């Protein structure tokens, strides 16, 4: 019934911040990052 370690304040943000507003594709992002190695010069 007694907590020596105080309870977390960062947890509040879970309700406040909309992490779920965007969900994206790992492999797509990981493609976009190298852009394009296949060009007129290839």
């Amino acid at each position: 019934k007694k907590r020596f370690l105080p309870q977390s304040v960062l947890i509040k943000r879970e309700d406040e911040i909309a992490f779920d507003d965007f969900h994206l594709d790992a492999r797509k992002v990981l493609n976009d990052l190298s852009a394009t190695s296949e060009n007129p010069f290839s």
């Binding site: 370690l5 977390s8 304040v9 911040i17 992490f19 507003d21 994206l24 594709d25 790992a26 492999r27």
Partner: protein
């Protein structure tokens, strides 16, 4: 000579009532066995429910230990077919973001800032403390997970 079907039937009656008495004791024991299964299963439900609840509590206090030792919190998790995500807050001047892991074998770690619904003022504050590139989706090596973490850590604590 011939036989009254009546004198013959009276025995089939006591046979029938016997067979029934039999069924009745069969059933009465079967009820005991079912009622046991129910006591046992009620026990398992009590236990399971409590052990889940404990596991949960223990997880959350380690979440607290990390939050006060290292000023970071991994809120949730999320799985596409594409990647596995974690929603994170860091600092005390607080930064929300996500880290994603491609669901393949080659690895380097996505970072995606979570900047929407932020005050035009707050944004300037974070931009003053934080490099420009840390407000854009990007990636860093696996090896650089710790180095990423304290990059943000130092940026908010200094």
């Amino acid at each position: 000579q011939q036989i009254d079907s009546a004198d013959l039937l009276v025995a089939n009656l006591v046979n029938e009532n016997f067979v029934l008495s039999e069924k009745l004791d069969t059933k009465a024991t079967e009820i005991k066995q079912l009622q046991k299964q129910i006591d046992s299963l009620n026990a398992q439900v009590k236990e399971l429910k409590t052990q889940t609840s404990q596991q949960a509590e223990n997880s959350e206090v380690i979440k607290d230990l990390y939050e006060y030792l290292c000023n970071v919190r991994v809120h949730k998790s999320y799985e596409d077919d594409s990647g596995l995500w974690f929603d994170i807050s860091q600092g005390t001047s607080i930064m929300d973001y996500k880290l994603g892991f491609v669901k393949a074998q080659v690895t380097e770690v996505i970072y995606a800032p979570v900047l929407k619904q932020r005050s035009t003022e707050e944004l300037y504050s974070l931009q003053s403390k934080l490099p420009e590139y840390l407000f854009e989706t990007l990636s860093f090596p696996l090896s650089s997970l710790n180095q990423f973490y304290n990059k943000i850590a130092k940026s908010l604590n200094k």
